[PDB]
Design a protein around this ligand. Structure first.
Ligand SMILES: CCNC(=O)N1CCN(C(C)=O)CC1
Length: 130
């Protein structure tokens, strides 16, 4: 229905706004673009599903997310990839893991405050009907 297409258009507006606020935060610059294969040649042998905030924007516009739960799977994949690839005690690895945890925690806190639970439930019931 036209009403259901309006629901998903509002979801995409909300997701672009949250993603922009993450992408402008200085702490999260390292997560804004795909890892460059030339600079990190082993990255794609260790990390089987790369993800970054530029790819998340492209996926919103391709209608890949029908729910906020769908979107948060990809935010969680950015964080888990960073914790897996950078697990050591040295300061460079501890800094990136601290930033990855802060990206996850910040996304979840914006959504807890600004996403209406009944809006999310409507998106989930439309998704389930298709
Ligand atoms: C050769 C230096 N290493 C890097 O430039 N990176 C940068 C990004 N990165 C991520 C997102 O996990 C780990 C490795």
């Amino acid at each position: 229905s036209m009403q259901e297409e309006d629901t998903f258009r509002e979801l995409r507006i909300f997701l672009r706004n949250v993603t922009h606020r993450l992408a402008i935060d200085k702490r999260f610059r390292v997560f804004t673009k795909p890892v460059d294969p030339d600079e990190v040649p082993d990255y794609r042998t260790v990390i089987k599903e790369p993800m970054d905030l530029s790819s998340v924007i492209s996926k919103i516009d391709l209608h890949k997310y029908l729910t906020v739960k769908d979107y948060l799977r990809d935010i969680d994949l950015i964080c888990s990839n960073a914790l897996e690839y950078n697990p050591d005690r040295d300061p460079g690895d501890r800094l990136i893991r601290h930033r990855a945890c802060a990206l996850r925690d910040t996304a979840y806190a914006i959504i807890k405050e600004e996403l209406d639970e009944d809006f999310e439930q409507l998106c989930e019931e439309i998704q389930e009907s298709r």
